[PDB]
Paper text:
On the contrary, the heteromeric GlyRs containing both the α and the β subunit are found throughout the central nervous system. However, due to the distinct characteristics of the α and β subunit transmembrane domains (TMD), symmetric activation in ECD resulted in asymmetric structural rearrangements in the TMD, leading to asymmetric pore dilation that is distinct from homomeric GlyRs.
All the orthosteric sites are empty. In our apo structure, all five binding pockets are empty and in the same apo conformation. In the apo state, 5-fold pseudosymmetry is maintained in the whole α1β GlyR, with tightly constricted ion conduction pore.
Numbering used by the authors:
A (entry chain C), D (entry chain A): 8 to 313, 383 to 419
B (entry chain B): 8 to 310, 383 to 419
C (entry chain D): 9 to 311, 384 to 419
E (entry chain E): 33 to 333, 443 to 475
The structure:
Amino acid sequence: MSPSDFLDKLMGRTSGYDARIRPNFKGPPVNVSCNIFINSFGSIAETTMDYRVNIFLRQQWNDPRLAYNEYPDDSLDLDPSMLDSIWKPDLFFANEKGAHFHEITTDNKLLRISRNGNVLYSIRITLTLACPMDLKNFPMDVQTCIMQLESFGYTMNDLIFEWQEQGAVQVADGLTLPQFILKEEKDLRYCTKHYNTGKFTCIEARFHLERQMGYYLIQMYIPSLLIVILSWISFWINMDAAPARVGLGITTVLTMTTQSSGSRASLPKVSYVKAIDIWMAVCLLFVFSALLEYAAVNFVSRQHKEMRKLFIQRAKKIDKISRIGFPMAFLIFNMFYWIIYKI
Amino acid sequence: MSPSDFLDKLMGRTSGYDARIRPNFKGPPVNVSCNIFINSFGSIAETTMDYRVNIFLRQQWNDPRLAYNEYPDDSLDLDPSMLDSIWKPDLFFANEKGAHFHEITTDNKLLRISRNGNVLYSIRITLTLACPMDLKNFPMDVQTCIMQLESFGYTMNDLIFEWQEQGAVQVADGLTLPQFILKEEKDLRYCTKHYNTGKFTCIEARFHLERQMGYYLIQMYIPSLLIVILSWISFWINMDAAPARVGLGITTVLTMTTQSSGSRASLPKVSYVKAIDIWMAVCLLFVFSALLEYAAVNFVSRQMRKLFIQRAKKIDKISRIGFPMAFLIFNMFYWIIYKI
Amino acid sequence: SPSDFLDKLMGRTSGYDARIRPNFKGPPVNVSCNIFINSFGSIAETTMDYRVNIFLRQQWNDPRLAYNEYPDDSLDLDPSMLDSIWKPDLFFANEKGAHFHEITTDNKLLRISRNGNVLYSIRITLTLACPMDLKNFPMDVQTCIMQLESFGYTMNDLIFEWQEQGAVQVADGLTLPQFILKEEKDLRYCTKHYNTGKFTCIEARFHLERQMGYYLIQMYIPSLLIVILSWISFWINMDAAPARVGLGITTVLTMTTQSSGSRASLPKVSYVKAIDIWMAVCLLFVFSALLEYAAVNFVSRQHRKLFIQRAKKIDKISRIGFPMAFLIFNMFYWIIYKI
Amino acid sequence: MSPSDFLDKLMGRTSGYDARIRPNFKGPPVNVSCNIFINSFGSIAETTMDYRVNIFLRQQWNDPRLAYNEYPDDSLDLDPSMLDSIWKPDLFFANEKGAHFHEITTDNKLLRISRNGNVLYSIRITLTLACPMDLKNFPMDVQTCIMQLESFGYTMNDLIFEWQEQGAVQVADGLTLPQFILKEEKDLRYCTKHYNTGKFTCIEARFHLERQMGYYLIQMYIPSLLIVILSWISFWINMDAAPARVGLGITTVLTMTTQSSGSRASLPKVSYVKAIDIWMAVCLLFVFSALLEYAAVNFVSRQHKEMRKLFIQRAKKIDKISRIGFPMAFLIFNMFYWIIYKI
Amino acid sequence: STSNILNRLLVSYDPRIRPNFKGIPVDVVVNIFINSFGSIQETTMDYRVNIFLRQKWNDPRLKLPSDFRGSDALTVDPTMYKCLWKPDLFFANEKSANFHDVTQENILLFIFRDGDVLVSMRLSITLSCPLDLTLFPMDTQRCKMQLESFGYTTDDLRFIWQSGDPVQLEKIALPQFDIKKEDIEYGNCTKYYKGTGYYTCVEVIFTLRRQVGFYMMGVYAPTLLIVVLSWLSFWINPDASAARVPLGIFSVLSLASECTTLAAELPKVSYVKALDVWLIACLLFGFASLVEYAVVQVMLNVIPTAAKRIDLYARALFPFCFLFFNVIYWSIYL
Ligand SMILES: *[C@@H]1O[C@H](CO)[C@@H](O)[C@H](O)[C@H]1NC(C)=O
Ligand SMILES: *[C@@H]1O[C@H](CO)[C@@H](O)[C@H](O)[C@H]1NC(C)=O
Ligand SMILES: *[C@@H]1O[C@H](CO)[C@@H](O)[C@H](O)[C@H]1NC(C)=O
Ligand SMILES: CCCCCCCCCCC
Ligand SMILES: CCCCCCCCCCC
Ligand SMILES: CCCCCCCCCCC
Ligand SMILES: CCCCCCCCCCC
Ligand SMILES: CCCCCCCCCCC
Ligand SMILES: CCCCCCCCCCC
Ligand SMILES: CCCCCCCCCCC
Ligand SMILES: CCCCCCCCCCC
Ligand SMILES: CCCCCCCCCCC
Ligand SMILES: CCCCCCCCCCC
Ligand SMILES: CCCCCCCCCC
Ligand SMILES: CCCCCCCCC
Ligand SMILES: CCCCCCCCC
Ligand SMILES: CCCCCCCCC
Ligand SMILES: CCCCCCCCC
Ligand SMILES: CCCCCCCCC
Ligand SMILES: CCCCCCCCC
Ligand SMILES: CCCCCCCCC
Ligand SMILES: CCCCCCCCC
Ligand SMILES: CCCCCCCCC
Ligand SMILES: CCCCCCC
Ligand SMILES: CCCCCCC
Ligand SMILES: CCCCCCC
Ligand SMILES: CCCCCCC
Ligand SMILES: CCCCCC
Ligand SMILES: CCCCCC
Ligand SMILES: CCCCCC
Ligand SMILES: CCCCCC
Ligand SMILES: CCCCCC
Ligand SMILES: CCCCCC
Ligand SMILES: CCCCCC
Ligand SMILES: [Cl-]
Ligand SMILES: [Cl-]
């Protein structure tokens, strides 16, 4: 049978087939149903704003010139070396940012021709696609990263890209991700870019990404709450214990600032304010204000001995009002923060 | 007698051999026996979920078209240049994530053909495979990283992969790794992907990895116990040395805070709660509880009415033996739930 | 057929030469080249570089390639035959590394019109380099440029020129960390003068501004709070020696650890930045507060009540002196770096 | 006579020379005398367990088919472009872990053929070789990193590798390394591998490495000693200054803890305990025991009054015995540590 | 017909034969135009650099025939460059390099009537130079760019720098170094390998100095004022133990924390440095202050109470010793 000789007879020098002429030339455009299969979705970074994927991109189209009827076998597998000399859609990724094929022990390409000219073309690609990311609400952000497929030399009247009806974009088994959770739902919006030359076909898929909260929650939020509670505790000690209260306040503020330093060391480097910087700043302001109010109490107390006992009663009243003002104000701030950053 | 010319006569333009048609075409599937030889296992990162290996991948199969009888020698080595013109199985790793060959002073490939058609195809690859990591219990986890060998353009009725009878996956001499120790047992599991286009053959090997409990134990757990015992030391002092008690409590809580902060860089950058974070949070909570207990004692004692002083003494006596017992209960729950 | 029409128009059977510029030994061949920034970012202070993706395209007349027999208005081409046609030798003077894109096809395009005009659009990824001066780090404004220049042609053979309108364009609202790319971007006209003649040059300047919210909060606010805490240490009685010493030394320690933790996030540079001055001055103020407490303690103890009166007067005169000094420093620091 | 034309006549289509067959076929094994010349030894890393070198690998052997006497020139150079037409040994590195050639303005390969048939073949390579490292005694370790040269497809009876008689490995000029010093004497082990298929030739050269105790011995060690001496200073204080003693002890604890925390950034990322972790743990334990003994003496003293001054005398006795007990224990620990990690 | 003349000129030409095969050695003039001086990676001892390499020599076999005139220069394709003979020039100390291909093979070739050939190309070579990190904050580094032949001895190939302008760097703005002029000399630094004869080599030396403003303001001044604060405890009354112990111990803690945090920001090499010596000396001074307070306390605990005399001694002993050490340190390290 010799399919290679049959392939040469069907297309080649003695066939008249041209590798640079699209099927149905000077006529209707040729639709290319392309469906992807994500195999490894990871390496999401904030410094360069990109992510890496592995795709089993397979695309199909009809070629009446390649259609045959004499050969008994329906499918004719074709090697990449001869695949170099067959017409293929000029597909490219609009935000590839860098990509390469895989050629381990064999080229990772597969082309088969059906009886009625249908062609299946599946290849393995690795892409460091780029998606802009916003960190206005860092610990509780929802991120969306997309990939776009477009023609490069064919307008809307020549090449058209359409997703499959069922299972256009699939995912592998229970692959994990650090600092992210890939949403099981991934809508497939349609695309179209109207350039100056004309209309180019384009399709995109959106991968919704959630962010984990346990580690950030514990390590950052909880010690801040404990330090703020200690700063509150600084109110219950006696007024005369000046070294004790000064040490407690200043050590709480040092603990807050070293927690902030550790966070900044372990946080993504971004110049605009995130949602955890607000929390750290507010906790620092709270402990600073507690130390300031202790200083005010001490100054009020000192002038009594240097009026009789009137100033002492005033200092006690300040302590009593503060011991209930601080927790309620902090609770109001916490309620507002969690309402505004969750709802 | 001119082995190159003999091989050209055996297979080539004049012999009619085809490099795109599998042996035993439109017939029984051709078996492949491939045995891996790990040469360098390392570079395990929990950030991108990948690890790098070196492999002496050698795969054998029988090709009747390559059988010869006139040549006297039993074997016949082949240069890679003409190796580029012979049928080879398209064995691709299902999670290769990137790789490349080796071409130092010569292509690192070898192909020899026996008299009966059996051919050995040993090559050198440097894979960086990908394996998901489960870090729920970080310091005491047992990861399982695997590699998969599968065909690409052939189904189960044409190409079937299988390991050797013994010693399919082998390892080199006593190579070492940081933060891991490779298990001497590596089961050779069997896989098969039932795609819509048919059944593609699959073989996989699982490498068991256990994390060492060394540096982590000492310099992440011991200081926490020391700081908690220092907080108990703060417990062991009277209620009138207020500057001393306050300073001891605040300095212990600051020491716990800086101990937690410093280890943040060493630990992997993950966002779900690990076993180590639970321990650090519990130790910080213990220190905070000790300081709060002292605050309550001071409030009551600063609150004849010596019974209040008697009640402060009772609180101190209770907390003398309450915190150690609670810490022991926590330490007996934690290690039992995370190790057994 | 269009496929072999290219061979008929140029090639073995036509006599066209692919190594000779059009209008040979005559007027220079103008090349109207315009770029399209597709992805701007990856700016690093360690290597003084940035990375872009460019849809570089350029037109130039070619009477040799001009045709009139073929009915079709346009005539596309593939890279295989594109490798055998004259193209301008356009290279970036500060590329520092480059590579094409070859995913599923070569990312190149070439079509020829009837009049001879040729379009040539390619997709490139350039890791260009620009020197960035961080003298005023939190309030800097960078200016990074790219230089398109010929290599083997003088200005009598090849001349570049930006498009009359929309020469440099930007994609949708891409976001960078630590930088906001200004919408305005001037297009200067460089020209290098060598001993062998004049080589063509064209440049586009990308003005960059740095956001300062996170820097402002996480560095300036704690330092100001620690200074206020030092003033609180001022606002205490003289006999409270343990409390005052502890407060002063712990404020000093807090400033030191704040600076130490801040040194990791900031770029590693060897000359003084505008934030190092602020941190050093705040630390100096805390040290001066501790020194003032030491002086008042030495004067008060020492020894009639005039010495204790002198210590009280020292506290009275330093209670409001430090706030005025800090306000003056703040006003002279923000004026000199924002105006 | 053009040497290029002479070489084309000697090996070519009309020459009969086969480049795919070893010299002395079905005869004695061919010996290769290869010597390396290290040019840039460095970039040693512990995360990937590898190091990088630049080697002027030159290997000499005899090819009887290259014998010529008509040409009067003693030496006959060969252009690097036509290296495919001459038989070369398939020398490969068993633990290369990756490498590449150099092609700056010309292929960095040389080949000249002597009159009697001797062949010289010098190339420039850049190997990122890999060597396991043991860090049980980190600040005083002695690493042993090696490189292995082996044949790939040829057994022991066909290809034999032997080092040059003198100067087999020659280090370059006074190049330095970070955190290491390369010993000027290196042994030349005669490796060999015995696989099932037969014996494959193998030759290895071992490089002995010595760590420096400099920056380490200063920063990781002297501050800990100073903190311990400060703790003994805390010992030498009156028992009445309870806040002073508590503060001095807890701060020394804080200083040791932050020293241990900060030191980890520079230290290698290793799970098993090193020789410096023991020192840090012992110093922390010493400071903790100091604070514990202070707590004990304070509790004993407070038992008096709170039955005569015998309790005060007992507390004083605890101080007197601790003042001299603990420094001697520290000296004993220091002697044992340095003896066990240096002898 | 500029292709036909060069084709006929290259007919019956052997690329493997150098000009003057049995004659005098060929002379090659080398020019370098540095575009960007890459950042030095002190961890792996290397520095990238992007250069314009221009080498010119003479080839009698490339004499332009009298029938064809063209112009004073002739150009051969940067894809047909392999037809003519090119010198085997490589950088001795380099460890990683590559050409540049942005739109074309950016190699320039000129052939003149008299026979001179001009070759221009782009490179991004990552050279290597051993760096001495002793006296780290105020050191000075020198790095080489040795160009060396690989296959020809001095009897066949020779490299000489262009008399006018060997290197023409214009603007670099290094993040941690600076230079404007470099030693274009040492060009005749010839390396000889025994058993192969003299090998030609041309060497240029770049002198790199490190700016010290950040280290002077970021470490030295804070550490000095911390030492001043450590002294400050001498003037407080001896009875104020609870006020003088915290000052010294927190000064020591601040010094230790600053040293530990500055670690991993300095280059990670294991040997003594000027900054390390300064930090350890300041830590020792704080330690000595605390020990002096301990001596005062033990002396304190009719008794003569000879502790104020110890304080009087210390008040003039500590600043004087620190100033003497500082003078010695600067005089020996600067
Ligand atoms: C799909 O392609 C065919 C030609 O192959 C064309 O006739 C038809 O109009 C196209 N329809 C779509 C879906 O665009
Ligand atoms: C290009 O510009 C030159 C002047 O520099 C002019 O002489 C010429 O006619 C213009 N057109 C072309 C493409 O030659
Ligand atoms: C350089 O030194 C060599 C001798 O080793 C020789 O070429 C000559 O004396 C010197 N000058 C030049 C230009 O080569
Ligand atoms: C949060 C700071 C409070 C400062 C003290 C305010 C006192 C107000 C009442 C004065 C009679
Ligand atoms: C920022 C320090 C504030 C100290 C207290 C000031 C009180 C002023 C009002 C007194 C009646
Ligand atoms: C945001 C912190 C508020 C602390 C309490 C302030 C009380 C001020 C009024 C006292 C009479
Ligand atoms: C911070 C050093 C202080 C030294 C003592 C100064 C004394 C000044 C007053 C003298 C009458
Ligand atoms: C650095 C603060 C200095 C404050 C003034 C001190 C004056 C001391 C002498 C008083 C007679
Ligand atoms: C329009 C720019 C304004 C910059 C800030 C000016 C601040 C002036 C007051 C400083 C105390
Ligand atoms: C903290 C170091 C103590 C050293 C010994 C001091 C002894 C002082 C008394 C001498 C009679
Ligand atoms: C870890 C230090 C132990 C010091 C000795 C304590 C003795 C306690 C019992 C006294 C009767
Ligand atoms: C490489 C020369 C080292 C000389 C000795 C330096 C000693 C520094 C520490 C002094 C206390
Ligand atoms: C305490 C004196 C500090 C300055 C010493 C300067 C020494 C001379 C330096 C010359 C560059
Ligand atoms: C500009 C960011 C606003 C975040 C939500 C509101 C926070 C209120 C804090 C009191
Ligand atoms: C998802 C957050 C879980 C936090 C658990 C804290 C347990 C403390 C003992
Ligand atoms: C103490 C305030 C808690 C607020 C929780 C909000 C949860 C929203 C889903
Ligand atoms: C851990 C804190 C316990 C507080 C108990 C207070 C009892 C008051 C009667
Ligand atoms: C999966 C979460 C387990 C949390 C266990 C907490 C045990 C506390 C003693
Ligand atoms: C009190 C903790 C005991 C932990 C025992 C662990 C045993 C593991 C085999
Ligand atoms: C933050 C401003 C404080 C102003 C204090 C003024 C005191 C005057 C006696
Ligand atoms: C490190 C152990 C403590 C020193 C021994 C003596 C302790 C007092 C009996
Ligand atoms: C460790 C410093 C001791 C200084 C003693 C000075 C004695 C002066 C009489
Ligand atoms: C009374 C003045 C004593 C000064 C001693 C100076 C010692 C310098 C080493
Ligand atoms: C009342 C004294 C004011 C001093 C101001 C100094 C800047
Ligand atoms: C360029 C120098 C600026 C000094 C500012 C001092 C506040
Ligand atoms: C190698 C010599 C070590 C001596 C140690 C003395 C404590
Ligand atoms: C700042 C040093 C002052 C010394 C005073 C000695 C009387
Ligand atoms: C949104 C800005 C908050 C600043 C708090 C100090
Ligand atoms: C008296 C209660 C005041 C609360 C302010 C938030
Ligand atoms: C850790 C010691 C506890 C003692 C209780 C009596
Ligand atoms: C974006 C400006 C933030 C200011 C916070 C004080
Ligand atoms: C804390 C120690 C108590 C010892 C009682 C005998
Ligand atoms: C070079 C600047 C030095 C500044 C010292 C305060
Ligand atoms: C440290 C010196 C002490 C001298 C006692 C007379
Ligand atoms: Cl304190
Ligand atoms: Cl820190």
